[PDB]
Amino acid sequence: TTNKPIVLSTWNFGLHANVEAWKVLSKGGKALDAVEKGVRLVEDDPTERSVGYGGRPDRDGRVTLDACIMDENYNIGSVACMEHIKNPISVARAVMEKTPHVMLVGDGALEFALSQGFKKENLLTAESEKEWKEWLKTSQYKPIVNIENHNTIGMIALDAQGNLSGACTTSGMAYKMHGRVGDSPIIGAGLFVDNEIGAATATGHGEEVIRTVGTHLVVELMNQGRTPQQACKEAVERIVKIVNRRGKNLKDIQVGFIALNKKGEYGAYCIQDGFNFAVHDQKGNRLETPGFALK
Amino acid sequence: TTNKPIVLSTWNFGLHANVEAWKVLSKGGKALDAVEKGVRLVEDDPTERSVGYGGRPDRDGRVTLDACIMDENYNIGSVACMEHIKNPISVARAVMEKTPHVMLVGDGALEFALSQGFKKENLLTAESEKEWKEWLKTSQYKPIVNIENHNTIGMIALDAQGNLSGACTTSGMAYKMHGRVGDSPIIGAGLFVDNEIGAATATGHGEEVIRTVGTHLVVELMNQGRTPQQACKEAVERIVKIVNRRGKNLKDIQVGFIALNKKGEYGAYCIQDGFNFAVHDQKGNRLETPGFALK
């Protein structure tokens, strides 16, 4: 009954990312290659302002990127707060495959990338520089999550061999403090893959996904018998109960999780309405809208 | 019956660290303050070569520190790959209490620390500089963890009010690649605290704890009803399984988990013999030896 291959990715642009991943998956390619190829599309696109090139800089005007990748056999790679490299997901893959470590950050991440042949490039576009200088006038930090403003791309897939893999990449919260790291490059937070169970990736206010260890929770729930959708929903309800305990207002928080199990069943859920995800399988590619907690 | 206050910490030096934490706990102080005070003792000690001052540098000769802290209400703070600040656990607490973020790395972490009044200091002792220059002769990276090598400090406590908190701090793997980050500053990996369940902290080959999201797993298992000891053991067993699946040899890996639940019950487990932990409660401070998987 397994439905494969299949790939899911976050937000409207995930539809286009899915097309690139499908080029690999539909030919029997590895899920690891498919998710890297898929998110690289968004990293390359200057018009996608929260991932790679064209990404909004931190408050010091520096574009620093974060990404992690995980394959079908517990191999992982991650880079955080790395500058000048357009495709951090690929540097993360290099960290995974070419070093005895699983996470490199800052200057050291760039140094490694360069040693691997990646090319130094100016990721700050004229548009981002302009918006940043404009923002500096009042310096009001107010993280907003949606197709406009903040987002990231997380992608998970099940290939023809029945193997799962995932990738997550972003330029992080616009105008963040220099050196700030969100959930996208943290294994178990922005992304988690267990080949015997399923995979999950999250998007939204990263700080909240980190404090709840979001994707590890989603996958563990699937391990405990929950369907992908129920797992995403239960995880969200956990951020909800936690958010209330911290005396915070749910309206100020947005998080979405998408998940896939070993059988190719998928699901998603979010705190607030307005989040969407793209799914591509034998029925084609489309954008779907999940359930939400804040009624 | 609830055993509180109580504090547990990793490795033999955890015994002396517990004495400092007990100064706070025995007076009815907050668990958050107790664990910060406890691990700061080790950060301050130049003779403890894998934590703060005196910590062995990365392969380029730079001492870069990592740490995270978590209180009783899901508040978290973390710094990774930060230089020149002797007490990263305290900068981590500042990230938690004074910023809209939960993790700062590299230059940005130092800049923030300085803005908060922390003082820049030379963390590379003459001894560490000497050993590093000696190591450079052959530059053979050999990740060694045991009773006398790479001993990070993770500390978790349950105070008189019945609240849990934890802290984890280290200088990382000796001669690591510049920018390498392990499990110590990652919430859900090196440390995790849920006041309605329990807390857990890890030590050892960090890469392995990150890939299994170790402490979140330990706490989630306690949520499912496992005793602290049972939870630590199963998390260790999950790493044992993954090491085998990745074609690696368990003899090259050491990971220890210690845990505490809301009732003050505690436990630990590790991969290889030789790992001890210290536990201090109203009956006294004890060096205890948990069970290990590698027979």
Coordinates of C-alpha atoms in Angstrom, one line a residue:
Chain A
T1 CA 0.0 0.0 0.0
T2 CA 3.1 2.2 0.2
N3 CA 2.8 5.4 -1.8
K4 CA 6.2 6.2 -3.3
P5 CA 8.0 8.2 -4.5
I6 CA 6.5 11.4 -2.8
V7 CA 7.9 14.7 -1.7
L8 CA 6.5 17.5 0.5
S9 CA 7.9 21.0 1.0
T10 CA 6.8 24.1 2.8
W11 CA 4.9 27.2 1.5
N12 CA 3.9 28.3 -2.1
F13 CA 7.4 28.2 -3.4
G14 CA 7.6 24.5 -2.4
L15 CA 5.5 23.8 -5.4
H16 CA 8.4 24.9 -7.7
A17 CA 10.9 23.2 -5.4
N18 CA 9.0 19.9 -5.7
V19 CA 9.3 20.0 -9.5
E20 CA 13.1 19.9 -9.2
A21 CA 13.0 17.2 -6.6
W22 CA 10.6 15.2 -8.8
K23 CA 13.2 15.2 -11.6
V24 CA 15.3 13.0 -9.4
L25 CA 12.6 11.0 -7.7
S26 CA 10.6 10.1 -10.8
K27 CA 13.8 8.6 -12.3
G28 CA 14.4 6.4 -9.3
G29 CA 17.0 8.7 -7.8
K30 CA 17.9 8.9 -4.1
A31 CA 15.8 11.0 -1.8
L32 CA 18.9 12.7 -0.5
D33 CA 19.8 14.0 -3.9
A34 CA 16.1 15.0 -4.6
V35 CA 15.8 17.2 -1.4
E36 CA 19.2 18.9 -2.0
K37 CA 18.3 19.7 -5.6
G38 CA 14.8 20.9 -4.5
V39 CA 15.8 23.4 -1.9
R40 CA 18.8 24.6 -3.9
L41 CA 16.3 26.0 -6.4
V42 CA 15.0 28.4 -3.7
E43 CA 18.5 29.2 -2.4
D44 CA 19.4 30.3 -5.9
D45 CA 16.4 32.5 -6.3
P46 CA 17.1 36.2 -5.4
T47 CA 13.3 36.8 -5.2
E48 CA 12.8 34.3 -2.4
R49 CA 13.9 36.7 0.4
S50 CA 14.2 34.2 3.3
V51 CA 16.4 31.5 1.7
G52 CA 19.9 31.8 0.5
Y53 CA 20.7 34.5 -2.2
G54 CA 18.6 37.6 -1.8
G55 CA 17.9 36.7 1.8
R56 CA 17.2 39.6 4.2
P57 CA 20.3 40.3 6.3
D58 CA 20.7 40.4 10.1
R59 CA 20.6 43.9 11.7
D60 CA 24.3 44.5 11.0
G61 CA 23.6 44.1 7.2
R62 CA 25.1 40.6 7.0
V63 CA 23.4 37.8 5.2
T64 CA 24.0 34.7 7.3
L65 CA 22.5 31.3 6.3
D66 CA 21.5 28.2 8.2
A67 CA 20.8 24.7 6.8
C68 CA 20.8 21.0 7.7
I69 CA 20.3 17.8 5.8
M70 CA 19.6 14.2 7.0
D71 CA 19.6 11.0 4.9
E72 CA 18.0 7.6 5.2
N73 CA 20.7 6.2 7.5
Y74 CA 21.1 8.7 10.4
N75 CA 23.8 10.7 8.6
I76 CA 23.5 14.4 9.2
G77 CA 25.1 17.7 8.3
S78 CA 24.5 21.3 9.3
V79 CA 25.8 24.8 8.9
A80 CA 24.7 27.8 10.8
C81 CA 25.4 31.5 10.5
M82 CA 27.5 31.1 7.3
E83 CA 28.2 34.0 5.0
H84 CA 29.0 34.3 1.3
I85 CA 28.0 30.8 0.1
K86 CA 24.8 30.6 -1.9
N87 CA 24.0 27.0 -1.3
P88 CA 24.4 26.2 2.4
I89 CA 22.3 23.0 2.0
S90 CA 25.2 21.6 -0.1
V91 CA 27.8 22.7 2.4
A92 CA 25.8 20.9 5.0
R93 CA 25.9 17.8 2.8
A94 CA 29.7 18.2 2.6
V95 CA 29.9 18.5 6.4
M96 CA 27.9 15.2 6.6
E97 CA 29.9 13.4 4.0
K98 CA 33.4 14.8 4.3
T99 CA 34.1 15.5 8.0
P100 CA 33.9 13.7 11.4
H101 CA 31.6 16.4 12.6
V102 CA 27.9 17.2 12.0
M103 CA 27.7 20.9 12.5
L104 CA 29.9 23.9 11.6
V105 CA 29.1 27.5 12.3
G106 CA 30.4 31.0 11.5
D107 CA 33.8 31.6 10.0
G108 CA 34.7 27.9 10.3
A109 CA 31.7 26.9 8.1
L110 CA 32.8 29.3 5.4
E111 CA 36.4 28.1 5.6
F112 CA 35.3 24.5 5.2
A113 CA 33.0 25.4 2.3
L114 CA 35.8 27.2 0.5
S115 CA 38.1 24.2 1.1
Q116 CA 35.5 22.1 -0.7
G117 CA 35.4 24.3 -3.8
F118 CA 32.3 26.4 -3.0
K119 CA 32.6 29.9 -4.4
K120 CA 32.4 33.1 -2.3
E121 CA 29.7 35.4 -3.5
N122 CA 27.9 38.6 -2.4
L123 CA 24.5 37.4 -1.2
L124 CA 23.2 40.8 -0.4
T125 CA 21.2 42.0 -3.3
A126 CA 20.5 45.7 -4.0
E127 CA 16.9 45.1 -2.9
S128 CA 17.9 43.6 0.4
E129 CA 20.5 46.3 1.1
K130 CA 17.8 49.0 0.4
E131 CA 15.2 47.4 2.7
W132 CA 17.8 46.9 5.4
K133 CA 18.9 50.6 5.4
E134 CA 15.3 51.6 5.4
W135 CA 14.6 49.3 8.4
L136 CA 17.6 50.8 10.3
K137 CA 15.7 54.1 10.7
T138 CA 13.6 52.7 13.5
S139 CA 15.1 49.3 14.1
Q140 CA 11.9 47.7 15.2
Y141 CA 12.3 43.9 15.4
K142 CA 8.9 42.3 14.8
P143 CA 9.2 38.7 13.4
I144 CA 6.2 38.0 11.1
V145 CA 5.6 34.6 9.5
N146 CA 3.8 34.1 6.1
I147 CA 4.5 34.0 2.4
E148 CA 5.6 37.6 2.7
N149 CA 8.0 38.4 5.5
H150 CA 9.5 35.3 7.2
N151 CA 9.5 31.7 6.0
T152 CA 12.1 29.0 5.1
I153 CA 12.0 25.9 3.0
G154 CA 11.9 22.5 4.5
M155 CA 11.6 19.5 2.2
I156 CA 11.1 15.7 3.0
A157 CA 10.8 12.9 0.6
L158 CA 10.4 9.1 0.2
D159 CA 12.1 7.7 -2.8
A160 CA 11.5 4.7 -5.0
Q161 CA 13.7 2.5 -2.7
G162 CA 11.4 3.4 0.2
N163 CA 14.1 5.6 1.8
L164 CA 13.5 9.0 3.5
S165 CA 15.6 12.1 3.5
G166 CA 15.1 15.8 4.2
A167 CA 16.6 19.3 3.9
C168 CA 16.0 22.6 5.5
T169 CA 17.5 26.0 4.5
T170 CA 16.9 29.7 5.3
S171 CA 18.5 33.1 5.7
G172 CA 16.7 33.3 9.1
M173 CA 14.7 36.0 10.7
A174 CA 15.2 39.3 8.9
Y175 CA 17.2 41.8 11.0
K176 CA 18.0 39.2 13.7
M177 CA 20.9 40.0 16.1
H178 CA 24.2 39.1 14.5
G179 CA 24.9 35.4 15.0
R180 CA 21.3 34.4 15.7
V181 CA 20.5 30.8 14.8
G182 CA 16.9 29.5 14.4
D183 CA 15.4 26.0 14.1
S184 CA 16.3 25.3 10.4
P185 CA 19.9 23.9 11.0
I186 CA 19.1 22.1 14.3
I187 CA 18.5 18.3 13.9
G188 CA 15.3 17.4 15.8
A189 CA 14.0 21.0 15.6
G190 CA 13.7 22.2 12.0
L191 CA 14.2 18.7 10.6
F192 CA 14.2 15.1 11.6
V193 CA 14.3 11.8 9.6
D194 CA 14.2 8.2 11.0
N195 CA 14.1 5.7 8.1
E196 CA 12.1 3.2 10.1
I197 CA 9.4 5.7 10.9
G198 CA 9.0 8.9 9.0
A199 CA 10.3 12.4 8.6
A200 CA 9.1 15.8 9.5
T201 CA 10.2 19.4 8.9
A202 CA 9.0 22.6 10.4
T203 CA 8.7 26.3 9.5
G204 CA 7.8 29.4 11.4
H205 CA 9.0 31.1 14.5
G206 CA 12.2 29.1 14.9
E207 CA 12.8 29.9 18.5
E208 CA 9.5 28.1 19.3
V209 CA 10.4 25.0 17.3
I210 CA 13.7 24.8 19.1
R211 CA 12.2 25.0 22.6
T212 CA 9.7 22.2 21.8
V213 CA 12.2 20.1 19.7
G214 CA 9.4 20.0 17.1
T215 CA 10.3 17.6 14.4
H216 CA 11.8 15.0 16.8
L217 CA 8.5 15.1 18.6
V218 CA 6.5 14.7 15.4
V219 CA 8.5 11.7 14.3
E220 CA 8.4 10.1 17.8
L221 CA 4.6 10.4 17.8
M222 CA 4.5 8.6 14.5
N223 CA 6.8 6.0 16.1
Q224 CA 4.1 5.7 18.8
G225 CA 1.4 4.9 16.3
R226 CA 0.1 8.4 15.3
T227 CA -0.6 9.0 11.6
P228 CA 1.4 11.9 10.1
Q229 CA -1.4 14.3 10.3
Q230 CA -2.2 13.4 13.9
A231 CA 1.5 13.6 14.8
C232 CA 1.7 17.1 13.4
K233 CA -1.5 18.1 15.2
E234 CA -0.4 16.7 18.5
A235 CA 2.9 18.5 18.2
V236 CA 1.2 21.8 17.5
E237 CA -1.1 21.4 20.4
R238 CA 2.1 21.0 22.5
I239 CA 3.4 24.4 21.3
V240 CA 0.0 25.7 22.1
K241 CA 0.0 24.5 25.7
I242 CA 3.6 25.5 26.1
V243 CA 3.0 29.0 24.7
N244 CA 0.1 29.5 27.2
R245 CA 2.4 28.4 30.1
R246 CA 4.9 31.1 29.1
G247 CA 2.1 33.7 29.3
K248 CA 2.4 34.4 25.6
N249 CA -0.4 35.2 23.1
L250 CA -0.9 32.5 20.4
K251 CA -1.7 35.1 17.8
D252 CA 2.0 36.1 17.9
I253 CA 3.3 32.6 17.1
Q254 CA 3.2 30.6 13.8
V255 CA 4.5 27.2 13.3
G256 CA 3.7 24.6 10.7
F257 CA 4.9 21.0 10.5
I258 CA 4.6 18.6 7.5
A259 CA 5.3 14.9 7.8
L260 CA 5.7 11.7 5.9
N261 CA 5.8 8.1 7.2
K262 CA 7.5 5.0 5.7
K263 CA 4.2 4.2 3.9
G264 CA 4.1 7.5 2.0
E265 CA 1.2 8.8 4.0
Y266 CA 1.6 12.5 4.8
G267 CA 0.1 15.2 6.9
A268 CA 0.5 18.7 8.2
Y269 CA -0.8 21.1 10.8
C270 CA -0.1 24.6 11.9
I271 CA -0.9 27.0 14.7
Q272 CA -2.6 29.6 12.5
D273 CA -4.4 29.5 9.3
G274 CA -2.6 30.7 6.1
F275 CA 0.2 28.2 5.9
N276 CA 0.3 25.8 2.9
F277 CA 2.6 23.1 1.7
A278 CA 3.2 21.4 -1.7
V279 CA 3.0 17.6 -2.2
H280 CA 4.1 15.8 -5.3
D281 CA 3.4 12.1 -5.9
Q282 CA 1.9 9.9 -8.6
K283 CA -1.1 12.2 -8.7
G284 CA 1.1 15.2 -9.5
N285 CA 2.1 18.3 -7.7
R286 CA -0.3 20.6 -5.8
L287 CA -0.6 23.0 -2.9
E288 CA -2.6 21.8 0.1
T289 CA -3.8 23.6 3.2
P290 CA -3.6 21.9 6.6
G291 CA -5.7 22.2 9.8
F292 CA -4.9 24.9 12.3
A293 CA -5.3 25.2 16.1
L294 CA -6.1 28.9 16.4
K295 CA -9.8 29.1 15.6
Chain B
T1 CA 7.4 10.8 48.5
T2 CA 9.5 13.3 46.6
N3 CA 13.3 13.6 46.9
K4 CA 14.1 17.3 46.6
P5 CA 16.2 19.3 46.4
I6 CA 18.5 17.1 44.3
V7 CA 21.1 17.8 41.7
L8 CA 23.0 15.5 39.3
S9 CA 26.0 16.2 37.2
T10 CA 28.3 14.3 34.8
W11 CA 31.7 12.8 35.5
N12 CA 33.8 12.8 38.6
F13 CA 34.3 16.5 38.7
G14 CA 30.5 16.7 39.0
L15 CA 31.0 15.9 42.7
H16 CA 32.7 19.2 43.5
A17 CA 30.3 21.1 41.1
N18 CA 27.4 19.6 43.1
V19 CA 28.7 21.1 46.3
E20 CA 28.4 24.6 44.7
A21 CA 25.0 23.9 43.4
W22 CA 23.9 22.6 46.8
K23 CA 24.8 26.0 48.4
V24 CA 21.9 27.4 46.4
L25 CA 19.5 24.4 46.6
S26 CA 20.0 23.8 50.3
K27 CA 18.9 27.4 51.0
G28 CA 15.8 27.0 49.0
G29 CA 17.2 28.7 46.0
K30 CA 16.0 28.3 42.4
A31 CA 17.2 25.3 40.4
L32 CA 18.2 27.7 37.6
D33 CA 20.6 29.6 39.8
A34 CA 21.9 26.3 41.3
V35 CA 22.9 24.7 38.0
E36 CA 24.4 27.9 36.6
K37 CA 26.5 28.3 39.8
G38 CA 27.5 24.6 39.7
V39 CA 28.8 24.5 36.1
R40 CA 30.5 27.9 36.4
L41 CA 32.8 26.3 38.9
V42 CA 34.2 24.0 36.2
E43 CA 34.3 26.8 33.5
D44 CA 36.5 28.8 36.0
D45 CA 38.9 25.8 36.6
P46 CA 41.9 25.9 34.3
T47 CA 42.7 22.3 35.2
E48 CA 39.4 21.1 33.7
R49 CA 40.5 20.9 30.1
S50 CA 37.1 20.3 28.4
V51 CA 35.1 23.1 29.9
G52 CA 35.6 26.9 29.7
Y53 CA 39.0 28.3 30.9
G54 CA 41.8 25.9 30.1
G55 CA 39.7 24.1 27.5
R56 CA 41.7 22.6 24.7
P57 CA 41.4 24.7 21.5
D58 CA 40.2 23.7 18.0
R59 CA 42.9 22.7 15.5
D60 CA 43.7 26.3 14.7
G61 CA 44.5 27.1 18.4
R62 CA 41.3 29.0 19.2
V63 CA 39.4 28.1 22.3
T64 CA 35.7 28.2 21.3
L65 CA 33.0 27.4 23.9
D66 CA 29.5 26.1 23.8
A67 CA 26.7 26.0 26.4
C68 CA 23.0 26.1 26.8
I69 CA 20.6 26.5 29.8
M70 CA 17.0 25.7 30.3
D71 CA 14.7 26.6 33.1
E72 CA 11.4 25.3 34.5
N73 CA 9.1 27.0 32.0
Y74 CA 10.6 26.2 28.6
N75 CA 12.8 29.3 28.6
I76 CA 16.1 28.6 26.8
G77 CA 19.4 30.2 26.0
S78 CA 22.4 29.0 24.1
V79 CA 25.8 30.2 22.8
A80 CA 28.1 28.2 20.5
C81 CA 31.6 28.7 19.2
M82 CA 32.1 31.7 21.4
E83 CA 35.6 33.0 22.2
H84 CA 37.2 35.0 25.0
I85 CA 34.4 34.7 27.6
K86 CA 35.1 32.4 30.5
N87 CA 31.5 31.7 31.5
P88 CA 29.4 30.8 28.4
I89 CA 26.7 29.3 30.6
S90 CA 26.0 32.8 31.9
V91 CA 26.0 34.4 28.4
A92 CA 23.6 31.7 27.5
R93 CA 21.4 32.7 30.4
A94 CA 21.6 36.3 29.1
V95 CA 20.6 35.2 25.6
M96 CA 17.5 33.6 27.3
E97 CA 16.6 36.5 29.6
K98 CA 17.6 39.5 27.5
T99 CA 17.0 38.8 23.9
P100 CA 14.2 37.7 21.5
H101 CA 16.4 34.8 20.4
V102 CA 17.5 31.5 22.0
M103 CA 20.8 30.9 20.3
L104 CA 23.8 33.1 19.3
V105 CA 27.0 31.8 17.7
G106 CA 30.4 33.0 16.8
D107 CA 31.4 36.7 16.7
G108 CA 27.8 37.7 17.4
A109 CA 27.7 35.7 20.7
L110 CA 30.9 37.6 21.9
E111 CA 29.5 41.0 20.8
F112 CA 26.4 40.3 22.8
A113 CA 28.4 39.1 25.8
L114 CA 30.4 42.3 25.8
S115 CA 27.2 44.4 25.6
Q116 CA 26.0 42.6 28.8
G117 CA 29.2 43.4 30.7
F118 CA 31.1 40.2 30.4
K119 CA 34.9 40.6 30.1
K120 CA 37.1 39.5 27.3
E121 CA 39.9 37.2 28.6
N122 CA 42.5 34.9 27.2
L123 CA 41.1 31.4 27.6
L124 CA 44.1 29.6 26.1
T125 CA 46.4 28.6 29.0
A126 CA 50.1 28.0 28.6
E127 CA 49.4 24.3 29.0
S128 CA 46.8 24.2 26.3
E129 CA 48.9 26.2 23.9
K130 CA 51.8 23.8 24.5
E131 CA 49.7 20.7 24.0
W132 CA 48.2 22.2 20.8
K133 CA 51.5 23.0 19.3
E134 CA 52.7 19.5 20.1
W135 CA 49.5 18.0 18.5
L136 CA 50.1 20.1 15.4
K137 CA 53.3 18.1 14.6
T138 CA 51.2 15.2 13.2
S139 CA 47.7 16.8 13.3
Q140 CA 46.0 13.5 13.9
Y141 CA 42.3 14.1 15.0
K142 CA 41.4 11.3 17.4
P143 CA 38.1 11.9 19.2
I144 CA 38.8 10.4 22.6
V145 CA 36.2 10.3 25.4
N146 CA 36.7 8.5 28.8
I147 CA 37.3 8.9 32.5
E148 CA 40.4 11.1 31.7
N149 CA 39.4 12.7 28.3
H150 CA 36.7 15.1 26.9
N151 CA 34.7 15.5 30.1
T152 CA 32.0 18.1 29.5
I153 CA 29.7 19.0 32.3
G154 CA 25.9 18.7 32.2
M155 CA 24.0 19.4 35.4
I156 CA 20.3 19.1 36.2
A157 CA 18.4 19.8 39.4
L158 CA 15.0 19.8 41.1
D159 CA 14.7 22.5 43.7
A160 CA 12.7 22.8 46.9
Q161 CA 9.8 24.3 45.0
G162 CA 9.7 21.2 42.8
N163 CA 11.1 23.0 39.7
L164 CA 13.6 21.6 37.3
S165 CA 16.5 23.3 35.4
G166 CA 19.6 22.3 33.7
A167 CA 22.9 23.6 32.2
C168 CA 25.5 22.2 29.8
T169 CA 28.9 23.7 29.0
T170 CA 32.1 22.6 27.2
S171 CA 35.1 23.7 25.2
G172 CA 34.2 21.0 22.7
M173 CA 36.3 18.2 21.1
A174 CA 40.0 18.9 21.4
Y175 CA 41.4 19.9 18.0
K176 CA 38.0 20.0 16.3
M177 CA 37.7 21.8 13.0
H178 CA 37.2 25.5 13.5
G179 CA 33.5 26.3 14.0
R180 CA 32.6 22.7 15.1
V181 CA 29.6 22.5 17.4
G182 CA 28.6 19.4 19.4
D183 CA 25.6 18.5 21.5
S184 CA 26.3 20.7 24.6
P185 CA 24.6 23.9 23.4
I186 CA 21.7 22.2 21.5
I187 CA 18.4 22.0 23.2
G188 CA 17.0 18.5 22.9
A189 CA 20.5 17.1 22.2
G190 CA 22.8 18.0 25.1
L191 CA 20.0 19.1 27.4
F192 CA 16.3 19.1 27.8
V193 CA 13.9 20.1 30.6
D194 CA 10.1 19.7 30.8
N195 CA 8.8 20.7 34.2
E196 CA 5.8 18.4 33.9
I197 CA 8.0 15.3 33.3
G198 CA 11.7 15.5 34.1
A199 CA 15.1 16.6 32.7
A200 CA 18.1 15.0 31.2
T201 CA 21.6 16.0 30.0
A202 CA 24.2 14.2 28.0
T203 CA 28.0 14.0 27.6
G204 CA 30.4 12.2 25.3
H205 CA 30.7 12.1 21.5
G206 CA 28.4 15.0 20.9
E207 CA 27.8 14.2 17.2
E208 CA 26.1 11.0 18.3
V209 CA 23.8 12.7 20.8
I210 CA 22.8 15.3 18.1
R211 CA 21.9 12.6 15.6
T212 CA 19.6 10.9 18.1
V213 CA 18.3 14.1 19.7
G214 CA 19.3 12.3 22.9
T215 CA 17.9 14.3 25.9
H216 CA 14.6 15.0 24.2
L217 CA 14.3 11.3 23.7
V218 CA 15.1 10.5 27.3
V219 CA 12.5 13.0 28.6
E220 CA 9.9 11.8 26.1
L221 CA 10.5 8.2 27.3
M222 CA 10.0 9.4 30.9
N223 CA 6.8 11.1 29.6
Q224 CA 5.8 7.6 28.4
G225 CA 6.4 6.2 31.8
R226 CA 9.9 4.9 31.8
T227 CA 11.9 5.4 35.0
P228 CA 14.8 7.9 34.7
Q229 CA 17.2 4.9 34.6
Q230 CA 15.1 3.0 32.0
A231 CA 14.8 6.1 29.9
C232 CA 18.6 6.7 29.8
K233 CA 19.2 3.1 29.0
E234 CA 16.9 3.0 26.0
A235 CA 18.4 6.2 24.6
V236 CA 21.8 4.6 24.9
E237 CA 20.5 1.5 23.2
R238 CA 19.1 3.6 20.3
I239 CA 22.6 5.0 19.8
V240 CA 24.1 1.5 19.9
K241 CA 21.6 0.5 17.2
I242 CA 22.4 3.5 15.0
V243 CA 26.2 3.0 15.4
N244 CA 25.7 -0.5 14.1
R245 CA 23.5 0.7 11.2
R246 CA 26.1 3.2 10.2
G247 CA 28.8 0.5 10.1
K248 CA 30.8 2.0 12.9
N249 CA 32.5 0.3 15.9
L250 CA 30.9 0.9 19.3
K251 CA 34.3 0.8 21.0
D252 CA 35.1 4.2 19.4
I253 CA 32.0 5.9 21.0
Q254 CA 31.2 7.0 24.5
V255 CA 27.9 8.7 25.6
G256 CA 26.5 9.1 29.0
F257 CA 22.9 10.3 29.9
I258 CA 21.8 11.3 33.4
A259 CA 18.1 12.0 34.2
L260 CA 15.7 13.2 36.9
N261 CA 11.9 13.1 37.0
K262 CA 9.5 15.4 38.8
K263 CA 9.5 13.2 41.9
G264 CA 13.3 13.5 42.3
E265 CA 13.9 9.9 41.1
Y266 CA 17.1 9.7 39.1
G267 CA 19.1 7.5 36.9
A268 CA 21.8 7.2 34.3
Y269 CA 23.3 4.9 31.6
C270 CA 26.2 4.9 29.3
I271 CA 27.8 3.1 26.3
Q272 CA 31.1 2.2 27.9
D273 CA 32.2 1.4 31.5
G274 CA 34.1 4.2 33.2
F275 CA 31.5 6.9 33.2
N276 CA 30.3 7.9 36.7
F277 CA 27.9 10.7 37.7
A278 CA 27.5 12.7 41.0
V279 CA 24.2 13.0 42.8
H280 CA 23.6 15.3 45.8
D281 CA 20.4 15.2 47.8
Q282 CA 19.5 15.7 51.4
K283 CA 21.2 12.5 52.3
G284 CA 24.5 13.6 50.9
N285 CA 26.7 13.8 47.8
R286 CA 27.5 10.5 46.1
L287 CA 29.6 9.4 43.1
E288 CA 27.6 6.7 41.4
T289 CA 28.3 4.3 38.5
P290 CA 25.5 3.4 36.1
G291 CA 25.1 0.4 33.9
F292 CA 26.8 0.4 30.4
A293 CA 25.8 -1.2 27.1
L294 CA 29.2 -2.3 25.9
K295 CA 29.9 -5.7 27.4

